[PDB]
């Protein structure tokens, strides 16, 4: 009962954003501002987690899966720079005021040339309500997100814009995932790898990760 | 059933120390060498604790409540400073190399005078491989634990020694209960309250905790 669950969280000052049936009978997976919790249908018991499914081809972290579900929903808000012939797809939490982020963007042609598609989500290191957050809100709301990001990173000024994109979601999700600096990379399998890597190195890293992830 | 849970734990190379009931249908409270886990009766899902009962006034850590069993099993290994007119009994995870722990101990007579009995368990912040662990191992192995603890704190040379006392167990239990620093107080109901509190404040805290946890 979603209603009972929200009342309990309310009494505790905890706010939820997503509730799903858990793989465990009588329980639900609840994403909150205190992390992913596991709560019984009656809202009377909460288990910290994470929850792992140890009944299948391998140990699956349900908490990580819940967070990846949030990332999936944010695909419509990602700024995508697709490689001509896509070999790898990475999601990068970036900050327009971040030096390494400036560098990463300036080398986008190279990452793309090496078959790496880069998808951006906003992560203002200075937090919400910062100049950085305000600036990225404008970019993400532009008529052409890519051109707007390109313009700003080029030192130009983007036109103020408003839309339903909420940078707080990008920031919050990054925090929940473990982002502690920018740029931060999230691999196609869900793994978080904080830090900047040049095109050639990144390509090598991703080829190896893909091979290691596939046992090859 | 026991078999399913035992087979799952075996798959993880984990050894179960005790399978107990859980306040949630379809799962059990399992104490292992990897901490307390909640495992469904079919052994298909594992949820890291702790679990909280939030059906009442304030949240209650049911995991810590259960662990009181482990805590009481170490009763004889505790260094006890009995209050003449005992009104409250608290268990404190302390580190002889911690300044706040020294400040608390120096006022032991005051806590005792306020009706607070203090029982110590050893918690080396620096881990089992530290001077703290070696020094407290000698204290807990002394003919007179109380005098030995006082001496060490006061800067006196404690006579080296060894015994059946395993500081590792005090450390392991503390970690499980959530000890994230010293001194850390464990209430008679399992509630962990990290931090130093002067005798007067401590007494007021315990009194209010009773009322807020009771209902009068």
PDB file of N, CA and C in Angstrom, chain A residues 8 12 23-25 27 38 40 43-55, chain B residues 8 11 23-24 27 38 40 43-55 59:
ATOM      1  N   UNK A   8       4.388   6.819   6.591  1.00  0.00           N
ATOM      2  CA  UNK A   8       5.489   6.470   7.478  1.00  0.00           C
ATOM      3  C   UNK A   8       6.705   7.329   7.154  1.00  0.00           C
ATOM      4  N   UNK A  12       8.743  10.477   9.311  1.00  0.00           N
ATOM      5  CA  UNK A  12      10.191  10.472   9.493  1.00  0.00           C
ATOM      6  C   UNK A  12      10.912  11.605   8.770  1.00  0.00           C
ATOM      7  N   UNK A  23      11.254  -7.771  -5.264  1.00  0.00           N
ATOM      8  CA  UNK A  23      11.252  -9.183  -5.665  1.00  0.00           C
ATOM      9  C   UNK A  23      10.804 -10.052  -4.491  1.00  0.00           C
ATOM     10  N   UNK A  24      10.786  -9.451  -3.307  1.00  0.00           N
ATOM     11  CA  UNK A  24      10.386 -10.145  -2.087  1.00  0.00           C
ATOM     12  C   UNK A  24       8.918  -9.877  -1.777  1.00  0.00           C
ATOM     13  N   UNK A  25       8.150 -10.949  -1.623  1.00  0.00           N
ATOM     14  CA  UNK A  25       6.726 -10.843  -1.327  1.00  0.00           C
ATOM     15  C   UNK A  25       6.416  -9.916  -0.154  1.00  0.00           C
ATOM     16  N   UNK A  27       6.832  -6.787   0.043  1.00  0.00           N
ATOM     17  CA  UNK A  27       7.729  -5.653   0.164  1.00  0.00           C
ATOM     18  C   UNK A  27       7.817  -4.834  -1.110  1.00  0.00           C
ATOM     19  N   UNK A  38      13.856  -0.674   1.589  1.00  0.00           N
ATOM     20  CA  UNK A  38      12.934  -1.766   1.343  1.00  0.00           C
ATOM     21  C   UNK A  38      11.916  -1.693   2.471  1.00  0.00           C
ATOM     22  N   UNK A  40       7.896  -2.825   3.940  1.00  0.00           N
ATOM     23  CA  UNK A  40       6.790  -3.771   3.833  1.00  0.00           C
ATOM     24  C   UNK A  40       5.529  -3.034   3.358  1.00  0.00           C
ATOM     25  N   UNK A  43       3.891  -0.529   5.514  1.00  0.00           N
ATOM     26  CA  UNK A  43       4.678   0.611   5.944  1.00  0.00           C
ATOM     27  C   UNK A  43       5.131   0.544   7.391  1.00  0.00           C
ATOM     28  N   UNK A  44       5.159  -0.655   7.963  1.00  0.00           N
ATOM     29  CA  UNK A  44       5.561  -0.804   9.356  1.00  0.00           C
ATOM     30  C   UNK A  44       7.006  -1.241   9.582  1.00  0.00           C
ATOM     31  N   UNK A  45       7.646  -1.786   8.554  1.00  0.00           N
ATOM     32  CA  UNK A  45       9.040  -2.204   8.679  1.00  0.00           C
ATOM     33  C   UNK A  45       9.864  -1.730   7.493  1.00  0.00           C
ATOM     34  N   UNK A  46      11.063  -1.243   7.785  1.00  0.00           N
ATOM     35  CA  UNK A  46      11.987  -0.758   6.765  1.00  0.00           C
ATOM     36  C   UNK A  46      13.324  -1.478   6.913  1.00  0.00           C
ATOM     37  N   UNK A  47      13.859  -1.985   5.806  1.00  0.00           N
ATOM     38  CA  UNK A  47      15.162  -2.642   5.828  1.00  0.00           C
ATOM     39  C   UNK A  47      16.087  -1.781   4.965  1.00  0.00           C
ATOM     40  N   UNK A  48      17.225  -1.389   5.530  1.00  0.00           N
ATOM     41  CA  UNK A  48      18.193  -0.536   4.842  1.00  0.00           C
ATOM     42  C   UNK A  48      18.629  -1.003   3.456  1.00  0.00           C
ATOM     43  N   UNK A  49      19.041  -2.257   3.342  1.00  0.00           N
ATOM     44  CA  UNK A  49      19.494  -2.738   2.049  1.00  0.00           C
ATOM     45  C   UNK A  49      20.971  -2.433   1.857  1.00  0.00           C
ATOM     46  N   UNK A  50      21.518  -2.642   0.653  1.00  0.00           N
ATOM     47  CA  UNK A  50      20.826  -3.143  -0.534  1.00  0.00           C
ATOM     48  C   UNK A  50      20.287  -4.567  -0.453  1.00  0.00           C
ATOM     49  N   UNK A  51      19.421  -4.885  -1.405  1.00  0.00           N
ATOM     50  CA  UNK A  51      18.819  -6.205  -1.524  1.00  0.00           C
ATOM     51  C   UNK A  51      19.525  -6.877  -2.691  1.00  0.00           C
ATOM     52  N   UNK A  52      19.852  -8.156  -2.534  1.00  0.00           N
ATOM     53  CA  UNK A  52      20.498  -8.902  -3.603  1.00  0.00           C
ATOM     54  C   UNK A  52      19.679 -10.128  -3.952  1.00  0.00           C
ATOM     55  N   UNK A  53      19.478 -10.344  -5.244  1.00  0.00           N
ATOM     56  CA  UNK A  53      18.777 -11.531  -5.691  1.00  0.00           C
ATOM     57  C   UNK A  53      19.902 -12.539  -5.872  1.00  0.00           C
ATOM     58  N   UNK A  54      19.883 -13.596  -5.071  1.00  0.00           N
ATOM     59  CA  UNK A  54      20.902 -14.630  -5.156  1.00  0.00           C
ATOM     60  C   UNK A  54      20.266 -15.902  -5.697  1.00  0.00           C
ATOM     61  N   UNK A  55      19.230 -15.724  -6.510  1.00  0.00           N
ATOM     62  CA  UNK A  55      18.512 -16.833  -7.125  1.00  0.00           C
ATOM     63  C   UNK A  55      18.411 -16.584  -8.625  1.00  0.00           C
TER      64      UNK A  55
ATOM     65  N   UNK B   8      22.314 -21.061   0.536  1.00  0.00           N
ATOM     66  CA  UNK B   8      22.603 -19.759  -0.056  1.00  0.00           C
ATOM     67  C   UNK B   8      23.842 -19.154   0.596  1.00  0.00           C
ATOM     68  N   UNK B  11      26.894 -20.759  -0.699  1.00  0.00           N
ATOM     69  CA  UNK B  11      27.281 -20.292  -2.027  1.00  0.00           C
ATOM     70  C   UNK B  11      28.184 -19.069  -1.940  1.00  0.00           C
ATOM     71  N   UNK B  23      10.501 -10.077  12.204  1.00  0.00           N
ATOM     72  CA  UNK B  23       9.140  -9.552  12.334  1.00  0.00           C
ATOM     73  C   UNK B  23       8.427  -9.395  10.991  1.00  0.00           C
ATOM     74  N   UNK B  24       9.066  -9.871   9.926  1.00  0.00           N
ATOM     75  CA  UNK B  24       8.486  -9.799   8.588  1.00  0.00           C
ATOM     76  C   UNK B  24       8.313 -11.218   8.056  1.00  0.00           C
ATOM     77  N   UNK B  27      10.794 -14.266   5.791  1.00  0.00           N
ATOM     78  CA  UNK B  27      12.236 -14.099   5.928  1.00  0.00           C
ATOM     79  C   UNK B  27      12.703 -14.353   7.350  1.00  0.00           C
ATOM     80  N   UNK B  38      19.165 -10.347   6.416  1.00  0.00           N
ATOM     81  CA  UNK B  38      17.788 -10.795   6.398  1.00  0.00           C
ATOM     82  C   UNK B  38      17.701 -11.611   5.125  1.00  0.00           C
ATOM     83  N   UNK B  40      15.279 -14.344   2.836  1.00  0.00           N
ATOM     84  CA  UNK B  40      13.957 -14.914   2.644  1.00  0.00           C
ATOM     85  C   UNK B  40      14.002 -16.416   2.907  1.00  0.00           C
ATOM     86  N   UNK B  43      15.624 -18.629   0.484  1.00  0.00           N
ATOM     87  CA  UNK B  43      17.040 -18.396   0.238  1.00  0.00           C
ATOM     88  C   UNK B  43      17.356 -17.655  -1.051  1.00  0.00           C
ATOM     89  N   UNK B  44      16.327 -17.139  -1.716  1.00  0.00           N
ATOM     90  CA  UNK B  44      16.511 -16.437  -2.980  1.00  0.00           C
ATOM     91  C   UNK B  44      16.922 -14.969  -2.877  1.00  0.00           C
ATOM     92  N   UNK B  45      16.621 -14.330  -1.750  1.00  0.00           N
ATOM     93  CA  UNK B  45      16.980 -12.929  -1.580  1.00  0.00           C
ATOM     94  C   UNK B  45      17.625 -12.627  -0.239  1.00  0.00           C
ATOM     95  N   UNK B  46      18.607 -11.734  -0.274  1.00  0.00           N
ATOM     96  CA  UNK B  46      19.332 -11.312   0.916  1.00  0.00           C
ATOM     97  C   UNK B  46      19.250  -9.792   0.997  1.00  0.00           C
ATOM     98  N   UNK B  47      18.953  -9.279   2.185  1.00  0.00           N
ATOM     99  CA  UNK B  47      18.863  -7.839   2.378  1.00  0.00           C
ATOM    100  C   UNK B  47      19.772  -7.465   3.541  1.00  0.00           C
ATOM    101  N   UNK B  48      20.722  -6.575   3.286  1.00  0.00           N
ATOM    102  CA  UNK B  48      21.620  -6.141   4.340  1.00  0.00           C
ATOM    103  C   UNK B  48      20.806  -5.328   5.333  1.00  0.00           C
ATOM    104  N   UNK B  49      21.095  -5.509   6.611  1.00  0.00           N
ATOM    105  CA  UNK B  49      20.372  -4.763   7.619  1.00  0.00           C
ATOM    106  C   UNK B  49      20.882  -3.337   7.704  1.00  0.00           C
ATOM    107  N   UNK B  50      20.457  -2.585   8.726  1.00  0.00           N
ATOM    108  CA  UNK B  50      19.532  -3.104   9.734  1.00  0.00           C
ATOM    109  C   UNK B  50      18.079  -2.961   9.313  1.00  0.00           C
ATOM    110  N   UNK B  51      17.196  -3.555  10.107  1.00  0.00           N
ATOM    111  CA  UNK B  51      15.763  -3.471   9.879  1.00  0.00           C
ATOM    112  C   UNK B  51      15.194  -2.593  10.990  1.00  0.00           C
ATOM    113  N   UNK B  52      14.212  -1.767  10.654  1.00  0.00           N
ATOM    114  CA  UNK B  52      13.602  -0.905  11.651  1.00  0.00           C
ATOM    115  C   UNK B  52      12.107  -1.153  11.741  1.00  0.00           C
ATOM    116  N   UNK B  53      11.581  -1.050  12.954  1.00  0.00           N
ATOM    117  CA  UNK B  53      10.152  -1.194  13.181  1.00  0.00           C
ATOM    118  C   UNK B  53       9.714   0.259  13.297  1.00  0.00           C
ATOM    119  N   UNK B  54       8.904   0.714  12.349  1.00  0.00           N
ATOM    120  CA  UNK B  54       8.440   2.094  12.362  1.00  0.00           C
ATOM    121  C   UNK B  54       6.924   2.172  12.483  1.00  0.00           C
ATOM    122  N   UNK B  55       6.350   1.211  13.197  1.00  0.00           N
ATOM    123  CA  UNK B  55       4.909   1.170  13.397  1.00  0.00           C
ATOM    124  C   UNK B  55       4.522   1.979  14.631  1.00  0.00           C
ATOM    125  N   UNK B  59      11.271   5.342  15.455  1.00  0.00           N
ATOM    126  CA  UNK B  59      11.849   4.132  14.867  1.00  0.00           C
ATOM    127  C   UNK B  59      12.685   3.342  15.869  1.00  0.00           C
TER     128      UNK B  59
END
